[PDB]
Amino acid sequence: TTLLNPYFGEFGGMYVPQILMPALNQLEEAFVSAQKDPEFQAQFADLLKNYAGRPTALTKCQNITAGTRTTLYLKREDLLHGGAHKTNQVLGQALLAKRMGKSEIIAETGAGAHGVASALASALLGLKCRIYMGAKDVERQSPNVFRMRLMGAEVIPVHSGSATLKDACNEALRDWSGSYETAHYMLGTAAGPHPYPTIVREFQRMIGEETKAQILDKEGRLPDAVIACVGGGSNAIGMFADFINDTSVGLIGVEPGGHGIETGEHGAPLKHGRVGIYFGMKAPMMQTADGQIEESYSISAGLDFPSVGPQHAYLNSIGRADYVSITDDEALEAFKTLCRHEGIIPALESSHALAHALKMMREQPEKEQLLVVNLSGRGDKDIFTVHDILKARG
Amino acid sequence: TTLLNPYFGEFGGMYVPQILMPALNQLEEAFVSAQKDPEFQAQFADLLKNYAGRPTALTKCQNITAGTRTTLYLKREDLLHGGAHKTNQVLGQALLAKRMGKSEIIAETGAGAHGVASALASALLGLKCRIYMGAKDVERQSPNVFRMRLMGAEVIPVHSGSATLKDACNEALRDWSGSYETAHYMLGTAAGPHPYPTIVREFQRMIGEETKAQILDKEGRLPDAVIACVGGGSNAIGMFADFINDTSVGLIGVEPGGHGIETGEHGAPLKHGRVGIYFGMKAPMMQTADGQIEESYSISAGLDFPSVGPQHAYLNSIGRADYVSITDDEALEAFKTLCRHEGIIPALESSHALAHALKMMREQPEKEQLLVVNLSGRGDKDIFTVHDILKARG
Amino acid sequence: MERYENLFAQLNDRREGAFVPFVTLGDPGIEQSLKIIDTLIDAGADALELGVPFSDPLADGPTIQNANLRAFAAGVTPAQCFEMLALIREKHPTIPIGLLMYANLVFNNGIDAFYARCEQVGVDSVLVADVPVEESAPFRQAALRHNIAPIFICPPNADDDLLRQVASYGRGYTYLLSRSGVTGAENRGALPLHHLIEKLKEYHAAPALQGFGISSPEQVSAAVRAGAAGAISGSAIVKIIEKNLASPKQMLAELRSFVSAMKAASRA
Amino acid sequence: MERYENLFAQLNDRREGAFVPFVTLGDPGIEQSLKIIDTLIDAGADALELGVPFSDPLADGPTIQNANLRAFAAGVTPAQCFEMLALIREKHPTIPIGLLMYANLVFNNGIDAFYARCEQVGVDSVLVADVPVEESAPFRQAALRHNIAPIFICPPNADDDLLRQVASYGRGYTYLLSRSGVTGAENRGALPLHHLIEKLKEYHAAPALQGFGISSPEQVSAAVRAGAAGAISGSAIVKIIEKNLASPKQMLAELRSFVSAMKAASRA
């Protein structure tokens, strides 16, 4: 029994051990209540404005589209406190944790961005925060781990399975299955069991709402398409949500193609994986032929979630949204291009969305199109990775 | 002959080789013209809003002041594009360069923040950018150097003198003395020969203007004091300017005390140096007994300018502003405190201002005071430095 | 499922509880696992709960996490597990065999086909650890079509609707969860479960087996005294495997000793 | 300043331009620098321009940057420089001695006291490289009080007001800058300066010496032919020091050779 539909079409659900069902039901109730509560909404708005820095800019990028009929704006989630869009929904979830009388936070992270956001919000709002991170990721993300610890969070390396994000996801759910009476699990993407896909969308939807208002002010019309990278699906669904009912507006999600789809070394389950049931949901998965869960490969650490949120699988199925992929090399070219032509250093995750917009422009340069790319994060964190690649090249 | 007074009291002036006087006069004229030009102002406002992300938040920090009668807000220049306040005036100066028909930019940098800001603005606005940086600083700031180069700037290591910021300052002026017909020198602080102290203040003053509007909205009155770190003086004077005529409002500048004033290893020339003439101005200097120029020592890379802007020396002389110092250890404690209690990682430079506010609160916890700290930058860049210190300690 | 009905009727006659060990199939290898399972039976196991190695066992604590890892290190696949299950049934005609599955392994090649394979090899029940009763319909339907008992979890946080649902939909046995959290011998259940046991009987549920954290004889006896039909032990059994990897013969001896003691404690 | 008036009157009589080398005091050490300066004089230098080592010589290119660094490596201080200047004057009664200073060294212990020390040691002129005419008042006043000629820069970018100011305020000589940029032999001045030379004469300025990038005899002759009273050479002289650090004797021989050639080119 739930208040809201746990499915988007065939996708989604609540595939958790029975012990966790009361926690999901409790969370769902608290959310539905919070969304009707002006006090909750006011506190959330205050944090987003005065602490996180919303609204974020919408930047017109004139140089990169010169000599084509593409007008490209970037939604600047890179300018949000924490340097990524993850901050938005962490603040909302931390307030739900408080609403429920929970005093502790559990979070998973792969790249570390969600972990940092969870740690910062927990510090601000007086919650005790524990973050699970695959042991391989802890090693790769020393800066983010240190940031989390500076902010008073406990970072717990996970050594089971492949010691990466999915294994961190498991550990968070094992902990929660034993601690839910006092702790909230602050899931970091629009995936997992209901009600998380719904909560994360609603707590990210200001991205698209602001974008719509900004584009109307600057251009007097809706965009032809909005384009966002898809790891688990949160930044994308936050950009897409407010436009779903605007049927003229294209919704393009970009999965990481890694070394190339044909290599198998990618992170594009929506278009190139197979539906399975894992991490509490029925959704497209990276998996073996036998049904073991596999990792997502990408140059970008944050596009490592080996499945995808169920609403994306649904929007794809009905043809409302279209999903594409961008390879490591394409993303790296987009990264360099934005740096040199617009003076913005984008996250490598976000660089996948930008790469697809550049392809839309370059393939058809005489097509009139008004595009928005969601710039989900800043790329300060990626300059070592890029350094090392360009060193190993030219 | 100038349009504006090149001095603040006894301090300031235009102590450059004769060859550079026409360039300063040209710059002064272009500025005075620009400040009366609605088109210039509109273009500047557009860049600040839509590219840099202004206005920045003013965050109330409840946790850190609990149990005292201090209310503390942070002006969030850490959220500006580039992660520091330096972006504001770089955009204005780049527009002046264009106004004058200059096509090239020269900049100095120590920590690299001004260099990155110069590189980003030059990329956006189509100017060819060359940055001088002391060879010692290039070595210490590999990330920032790489960011500058990614954005298409030429970074030129300076090996003369002490191979640090002052030596970069010299090299920029030597280059300009030969290239001024085509290149603008984008000085990075509120110091140097007239008209730079004036231009940099006017192109940073939105910090204080926004702060005044924000504090009036939230508190219904002006702050009791506004507090900012002082390297060369730009973030501080940008915070102070709009409050100078509000005589109830304290203006507190914080110089780096390094290992302690008594050690001589500090960067606090305003209160502990000696007036001299160098880098085009008459101002307090770090210098030997014989009059050779010395370096500023601080844990924080950006508080390395070995003198101070002339307007600060003037505001001190007349008793309008008060200047204090904060040691490395105080700044480090403030850094850790903000991270853990407010979920904000501050630049170590900015941490000096926060440290002095914490001292104001802690020394007199029953004093009712409404304080604003200018949070001049984010501290992502400093987590390695902090890591290494805390490793060498506990 | 009929094997459970027959077992429970017989145990009622011998005034005994059931003792049911869990192991991971193919831990630490196929051949040793077959010997382990035969030892458990010979030593007095009344029924078996058997795990198919899965990449992401999110209801399992470290002991069973490591058992899955050992089996993967041995290259164990689900197909090999089904081969094992066929052989185990060919050896032992009446012992109830229950599998502990994760949903993706059941859904992977089609739910119906999964339960058809279970029926073909002679499995009696399937517990899907990450499918709550709310999501159970296609699983329990396929199970019943293929004469497999669907095993439902009755958590200690159960309300009346849940008890009625589990009583109605389940067959074979009702899994009575000792406590919240994940599998593990290091955490003992600190909750009286008598009331749940009574309500399940009221609603004609499949007989209850208590599981999670059962590692000692006194816990087996306690389960029976509270009205449960028996008790399941997993981590304690697997720890004996883990403790004795270097000594296969000693492993079996210790398994025999442990299972014998645990079975003896089921005498009312 | 009277030494310059006397020199220029004498050179007018010998129909010669002045040849004026620059060196950094104490480069590469005090003793060698004294020998260098005596060699320049013996070889035909008409006047001297002498730099006091400064931490931040922002009007100097790399050649003279390195001369300052050498002198600092030798531990040379301004006090030692003034000792040197006293000795140089004690050796040579009539040669004009001009210093090339940066403002902070003049301002450091008081402007007046600086010029009083110059007068005490027998200096004839001071050029402060980072003080434009606009800022010159306290410097030129102190200079004149102490019978020191204030040397002003006439840049090629000079307008009429600047020419009139430099003509009025200056004494000794007027420094005619060959070009924009900083000191250095690697950059030759590509601008005809005859018009400036004529205007300065019109306004009764101190006689003009051309400087910046003068490294060859033809440039000395060109300066004289254009109407200048002479020419200053710095980087070319200092490069001979730099080239010959390892060989003090050869250094002096090459300095003598160079200065002799450059002085010979000043004959009209």
Ligand SMILES: Cc1ncc(COP(=O)(O)O)c(/C=N/[C@@H](CO)C(=O)O)c1O
């Ligand atoms: C800057 C940025 N953009 C996009 C994404 C992609 O995530 P969605 O699809 O927007 O949910 C991420 C993800 N990071 C996660 C997983 O490693 C994490 O930090 O834990 C990110 O850090």
Ligand SMILES: Cc1ncc(COP(=O)(O)O)c(/C=N/[C@@H](CO)C(=O)O)c1O
């Ligand atoms: C984040 C931050 N806050 C304050 C200051 C201090 O400079 P003002 O006093 O505000 O002008 C700096 C300085 N940085 C210079 C010099 O190294 C530079 O980057 O080149 C800074 O980077």
Ligand SMILES: O=P(O)(O)OCCNS(=O)(=O)c1ccc(OC(F)(F)F)cc1
């Ligand atoms: O003795 P322990 O503590 O190791 O417990 C033994 C567990 N083995 S099992 O197959 O019964 C078993 C039963 C239920 C499980 O998860 C669920 F409850 F969510 F469904 C997991 C394993």
Ligand SMILES: O=P(O)(O)OCCNS(=O)(=O)c1ccc(OC(F)(F)F)cc1
């Ligand atoms: O031959 P070069 O090119 O080395 O030039 C010699 C320079 N030596 S100097 O003392 O006359 C001299 C004169 C003026 C200077 O700067 C100023 F013009 F800004 F004032 C610097 C040095």
Ligand SMILES: [Cl-]
């Ligand atoms: Cl519903």
Ligand SMILES: [Cl-]
């Ligand atoms: Cl459904």
Ligand SMILES: [Cl-]
């Ligand atoms: Cl609990």
Ligand SMILES: [Cl-]
């Ligand atoms: Cl808006």
Ligand SMILES: [Cl-]
């Ligand atoms: Cl609206």
Ligand SMILES: [Cl-]
């Ligand atoms: Cl419009």
Ligand SMILES: [Cl-]
């Ligand atoms: Cl498909």
Ligand SMILES: [Cl-]
């Ligand atoms: Cl990955």
Ligand SMILES: [Cl-]
């Ligand atoms: Cl396309």
Ligand SMILES: [Cl-]
């Ligand atoms: Cl279109």
Ligand SMILES: [Cl-]
């Ligand atoms: Cl004026």
Ligand SMILES: [Cl-]
């Ligand atoms: Cl004055």
